[PDB]
Design a protein around this ligand. Structure first.
Ligand SMILES: CC(C)(O)c1ccc2c(NC(=O)Cc3cccc(Cl)c3)cncc2c1
Ligand SMILES: CC(C)(O)c1ccc2c(NC(=O)Cc3cccc(Cl)c3)cncc2c1
Ligand SMILES: [Cl-]
Lengths: 305, 299
């Protein structure tokens, strides 16, 4: 019993964190085999950030201009290339602690664990989700750039995010491990704002199923809804449209609890209308949207209370 | 910017998790040097000394990854069983066994069959239970903090109470709270809110640009403690006020100034507003957790 925002064990990622220094800038890098991956803005000053020409800045650099530190050991840079917004530093030593891994690009609504680092050293780990507006509500300070997001499915680490920057509203933006940003953001100091955020409906529904599994049914009602009428109501509360794919994904939770997806949709409709009236669901006074249907099956029991 | 319930990096603890099997029971153990620590109920009104005297070393199966560890000795210390093994753990970190106080927080590395499945942050509640996320097979999962490079082990999971909350011991086998390791009618006492933690969290909201709850008013520690007692809040002591000193200095808001803001939230609610994305007053962040997350301390 119990339900917590749970992160994946960070050990396999801690063994990959290195410190990258270029001139006066110092951020984190990901050391996998003989390559160190880090944000390409490590080559920039605060001046270049207004309109950086990365190709022109990088052509002026040599291997010895980059200092890579793995623990107390210095790594020698033997090559360098840019792939989109990520700089790939070829080093002379393969990481013996390299885990089995994949670079995956996630979709908004997907969750992942974040290993926050400063100077190549991990300071903390937390769970979070890719928001519909392609930003993450993380907890990062200056020096966190190069911190990575990941999922660990079975024994393989799936790298899905590299932290690059903080937007003016305090939210964060970054790229997949190929250097392709999530969202319409650029690694430039520009008046770019996060689009209006929306609630991840399929996740709130998954979390309501987790509450039913943990013995809480106070929110259920005798009503059902059409998929269209639910979306017409949910959009009024800034909720993401629930698609047929979402309904199909919720199938196993619906089967395990005996509550149809559109019957759960009806109680979400009522919850949005009535609020909680002093009650909580899984210890929360708000509707939680950072647990996917996959996270709920993973964390909750297979036997309903 | 941003404020999340953040756990310590679990890597130094993952390298210590082993699977312990005794007969039909299978739970987790902590392998430090040549000793495996696990709940003594792995051998299970139980007379533990009488059950243990009937066991031999080969009755215990210890699995570290795919390797089998050979048990060469065994002893009991309170509610924890210490299995002497033939191999020192090469991944043993620098460590200490510490007993924590209610209100203090720690990281939990949840495991099943000697394999870590997840990590999460939580606090020792005033009623000595933890609001964890555990399933059958989680017994032997450990709680820890990291101080520089040293792992402080503070909790070993033992059981789930009927209300869905959890109970366990320090690494010396001494339970937190009036609990016993056996199947009987045990209930968690009435819980209280950790006031010093809610105050620390209000300071974190001020640091992150949330000041709507601040007012021009102050209070005496005595007048606030009456209000704390009415709302099932833990009494705020002078030690708590002294501990909040650095947060008070960093934000320019006196502890009793912040206490008057909490008094108005307790008496009147949030009125549709949230603090750090929460509609409830959060009490599982200590004043040190607030400082550490709003600075950038690494291990
Ligand atoms: C101090 C403060 C505001 O809390 C802070 C300050 C900086 C933070 C940060 N670094 C940057 O944004 C560097 C940067 C600058 C311009 C463009 C680009 Cl692409 C990158 C990343 N995450 C959290 C950060 C938090
Ligand atoms: C099935 C369910 C509710 O998920 C569950 C069941 C058991 C759980 C568990 N173990 C026990 O409580 C076993 C037990 C019994 C009597 C005395 C003692 Cl000391 C221990 C620990 N954590 C989560 C547990 C969760
Ligand atoms: Cl995805």
């Amino acid at each position: 019993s119990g339900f917590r925002k749970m992160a994946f064990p960070s050990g396999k990622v801690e063994g990959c964190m290195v410190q990258v220094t270029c001139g006066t800038t110092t951020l984190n890098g990901l050391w996998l085999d003989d390559v160190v991956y880090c944000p390409r803005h490590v080559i920039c000053t605060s001046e270049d950030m207004l309109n950086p020409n990365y190709e022109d800045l990088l052509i002026r650099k040599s291997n010895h201009n980059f200092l890579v530190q793995a623990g107390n050991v210095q790594l020698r840079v033997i090559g360098h290339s840019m792939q989109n917004c990520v700089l790939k530093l070829k080093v002379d030593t393969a990481n013996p602690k390299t885990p089995k891994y994949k670079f995956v690009r996630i979709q908004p609504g997907q969750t992942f664990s974040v290993l926050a680092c400063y100077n190549g050293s991990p300071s903390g780990v937390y769970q979070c989700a890719m928001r519909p507006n392609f930003t993450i509500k993380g907890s990062f300070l200056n020096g966190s750039c190069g911190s990575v997001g990941f999922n660990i499915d079975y024994d393989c680490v799936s790298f899905c995010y590299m932290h690059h920057m903080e937007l003016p509203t305090g939210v964060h933006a970054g790229t997949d491990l190929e250097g392709n940003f999530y969202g319409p953001f650029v690694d430039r100091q520009t008046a770019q704002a996060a689009g209006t955020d929306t609630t991840i409906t399929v996740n709130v529904l998954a979390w309501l199923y987790a509450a039913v599994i943990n013995g809480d049914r106070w929110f259920l009602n005798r009503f059902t809804t059409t998929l269209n009428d639910f979306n017409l109501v949910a959009m009024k509360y800034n909720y993401e449209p629930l698609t047929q794919d979402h309904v199909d994904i919720l199938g196993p939770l619906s089967a395990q609890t005996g509550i149809a997806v559109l019957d759960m949709c009806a109680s979400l409709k009522e919850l949005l209308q009535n609020g909680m009236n002093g009650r909580t669901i899984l210890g929360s006074a708000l509707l939680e949207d950072e647990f996917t249907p996959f996270d709920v099956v993973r964390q909750c029991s297979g036997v309903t209370f």
